[PDB]
Amino acid sequence: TKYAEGTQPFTVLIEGNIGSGKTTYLNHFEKYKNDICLLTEPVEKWRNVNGVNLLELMYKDPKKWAMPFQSYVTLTMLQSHTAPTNKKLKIMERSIFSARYCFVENMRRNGSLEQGMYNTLEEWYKFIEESIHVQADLIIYLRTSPEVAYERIRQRARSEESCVPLKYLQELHELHEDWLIHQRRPQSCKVLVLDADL
Amino acid sequence: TKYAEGTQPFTVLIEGNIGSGKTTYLNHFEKYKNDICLLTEPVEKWRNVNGVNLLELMYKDPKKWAMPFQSYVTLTMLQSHTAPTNKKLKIMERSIFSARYCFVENMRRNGSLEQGMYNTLEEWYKFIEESIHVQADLIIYLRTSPEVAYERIRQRARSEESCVPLKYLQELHELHEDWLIHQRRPQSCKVLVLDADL
Numbered sequence: 001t002k003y004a005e006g007t008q009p010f011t012v013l014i015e016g017n018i019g020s021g022k023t024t025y026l027n028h029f030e031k032y033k034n035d036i037c038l039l040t041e042p043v044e045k046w047r048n049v050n051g052v053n054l055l056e057l058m059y060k061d062p063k064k065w066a067m068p069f070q071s072y073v074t075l076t077m078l079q080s081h082t083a084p085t086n087k088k089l090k091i092m093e094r095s096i097f098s099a100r101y102c103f104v105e106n107m108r109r110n111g112s113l114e115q116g117m118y119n120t121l122e123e124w125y126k127f128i129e130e131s132i133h134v135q136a137d138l139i140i141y142l143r144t145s146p147e148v149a150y151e152r153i154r155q156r157a158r159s160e161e162s163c164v165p166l167k168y169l170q171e172l173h174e175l176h177e178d179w180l181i182h183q184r185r186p187q188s189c190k191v192l193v194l195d196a197d198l
Numbered sequence: 199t200k201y202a203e204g205t206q207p208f209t210v211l212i213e214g215n216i217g218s219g220k221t222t223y224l225n226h227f228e229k230y231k232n233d234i235c236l237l238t239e240p241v242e243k244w245r246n247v248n249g250v251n252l253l254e255l256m257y258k259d260p261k262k263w264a265m266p267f268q269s270y271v272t273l274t275m276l277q278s279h280t281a282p283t284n285k286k287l288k289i290m291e292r293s294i295f296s297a298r299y300c301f302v303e304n305m306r307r308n309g310s311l312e313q314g315m316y317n318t319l320e321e322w323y324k325f326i327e328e329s330i331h332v333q334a335d336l337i338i339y340l341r342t343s344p345e346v347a348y349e350r351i352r353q354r355a356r357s358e359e360s361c362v363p364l365k366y367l368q369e370l371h372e373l374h375e376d377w378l379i380h381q382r383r384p385q386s387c388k389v390l391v392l393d394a395d396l
């Protein structure tokens with residue numbers, strides 16, 4: 001038996017590269033607020049954990065902060081996935097799956113996460129699949145090109161993201177492609193692809 | 199509802215400072231193996247995670263490895279607490295509580311865990327109290343003096359523990375005292391104190 005088992009409505013996950021417009025897309029269901037549970041912009045929690053800016057620390061010193069950061073991302077996603085609600089529909093920005101299959105994986109590849117850190121995170125993900133229920137009915141993939149994404153990221157101008165290189169976005173892009181289109185990672189249940197290049 | 203809710207027998211937790219003799223004490227129930235579920239010496243898992251020795255890495259470079267290490271200690275304890283069993287009695291060496299109240303706390307105090315890491319771990323502990331069931335009926339506290347503990351630690355001679363100073367054991371001792379005796383924190387579980395100075 002898993003925590004939050006049979007407590008979640010139909011759930012839609014909004015996925016896409018950084019700056020692909022996941023939040024923008026979600027602001028459209030804004031008026032149906034009292035009929036749909038909307039969990040958006042999780043980044044705000046990561047930028048202020050009792051005063052600490054984990055997102056920034058991670059970008060400045062990955063070798064040391066990538067692990068605690070991803071562990072916190074995992075926790076907050078899990079909290080949203082299992083959050084109680086009455087509404088009949090639930091839509092989330094991001095999910096525990098993109099954190100695992102795209103970000104953690106990429107950080108293992110670029111050396112940000114030493115092997116021992118990668119394994120710890122992976123062991124947590126395995127235990128989570130077995131002890132906690134993660135409702136995932138539909139995934140809307142806002143497909144974009146790394147260049148477009150890079151543009152939007154810079155226009156938003158989050159101080160923490162000021163040093164994010166285009167290669168990084170290209171790596172993340174391929175990883176989203178592998179998971180959501182080609183389905184290389186155990187998921188891709190029901191995916192709806194949308195051209196998010198405006 | 200919590201994972202593993204109403205699936206656990208009467209559970210006894212064996213606590214005590216490093217080298218207090220928790221494993222030695224547990225080897226005495228060894229013959230009742232087929233009537234009591236015995237989960238001992240969790241350190242072995244921490245010393246070999248798919249080939250990686252987290253325990254060692256933590257002692258050599260705390261600022262960087264204390265967080266992933268404690269996150270893995272938490273995970274394995276949680277796995278033991280929720281492990282399925284038919285037997286009517288369950289006895290464990292250590293628990294998620296000593297990892298939180300004694301080790302994580304001490305590491306926050308000596309600077310091994312930056313505040314951002316401490317908070318991440320604490321947020322996980324809070325989410326765990328609400329989503330997962332941790333059976334705790336009795337806690338046997340093997341009370342010892344830091345000096346005795348230091349002696350046993352070095353007779354055992356674990357390579358990873360070769361640099362553990364007496365002060366460290368004194369700090370851990372007080373923390374065990376505060377929790378299991380003075381009650382300076384979260385636990386309404388019955389405790390049986392045993393003089394473990396042989």
Ligand SMILES: Cc1cn([C@H]2C[C@H](O)[C@@H](COP(=O)(O)OP(=O)(O)OP(=O)(O)O)O2)c(=O)[nH]c1=O
Nearest residue numbers: 017018019020021022023024043073094099103
């Ligand atoms: C989900 C996730 C995000 N992040 C980082 C990447 C970004 O700098 C920041 C937020 O990325 P996103 O989760 O993509 O959110 P966003 O608001 O930037 O996206 P959009 O414009 O489509 O609304 O968090 C990680 O480092 N790890 C993770 O596991």
Ligand SMILES: Cc1cn([C@H]2C[C@H](O)[C@@H](COP(=O)(O)OP(=O)(O)OP(=O)(O)O)O2)c(=O)[nH]c1=O
Nearest residue numbers: 215216217218219220221222241271292297301
């Ligand atoms: C539980 C726990 C142990 N440890 C470390 C301290 C030690 O070096 C090692 C094992 O400590 P203990 O958990 O005390 O186990 P032990 O086998 O050393 O004890 P005893 O002799 O009583 O059987 O793990 C942590 O760093 N963090 C933790 O949260």
Ligand SMILES: [Mg+2]
Nearest residue numbers: 022023041093
């Ligand atoms: Mg967003």
Ligand SMILES: [Mg+2]
Nearest residue numbers: 220221239291
């Ligand atoms: Mg032992």
